RNA sequence: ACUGAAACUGUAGUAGAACCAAUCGGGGUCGUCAAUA
């Protein structure tokens, strides 16, 4: 039940029983008032292209290649030892790598060197 | 070459009216640490 004070002074207006507008007309015209002040601000030819809309919707959706999601380490395992940190000294005598933006969807290799 | 006497500083009057103990905060989560040989 959403109302713009215009609405909320009619409610008020009575204490008879009033219509309640159809915010459902409204709620794609509020989406596309918030989407094209994103657009403009933030330009782009596109909303959907804006960085942070685009790896906010890629952390809302997940990562699209199967690649499994897990702290980084040297093996397709969880050993139970739980060496995670040596991914990262491998990687750091390694390829160095950074990790990848949201939006690009680029998976880890398990042996960063 | 005579102390004046007698007379409640009392009577009426609500320390009260107004004022939100309240604003913000996912019980959450990854790679570091040590320095030589």
Same mark, same amino acid.
């Given at each position: 039940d959403l109302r713009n004070g215009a609405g909320w002074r009619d409610y008020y207006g009575s204490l008879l029983e009033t219509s309640q507008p159809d915010f459902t007309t409204?709620?794609?015209q509020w989406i596309n008032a918030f989407q094209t002040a &994103?657009?403009? %601000?933030?330009?782009?030819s596109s909303f959907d292209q804006v960085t942070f809309i685009?790896?906010?919707?890629?952390s809302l959706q997940g990562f699209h290649d199967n690649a499994?999601?897990?702290y980084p380490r040297s093996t397709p395992?969880?050993?139970?030892?739980?060496?995670?940190?040596?991914?990262? &000294?491998?990687? %750091?005598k390694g390829?160095?790598?950074?990790?990848?933006?949201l939006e690009k969807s680029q998976s880890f290799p398990i042996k960063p060197s």
């Open positions: 409204l709620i794609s &994103v657009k403009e %601000e933030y330009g782009s685009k790896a906010s919707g890629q499994s999601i897990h395992e969880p050993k139970p030892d739980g060496e995670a940190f040596k991914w990262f &000294v491998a990687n %750091e390829r160095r790598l950074a990790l990848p933006a």
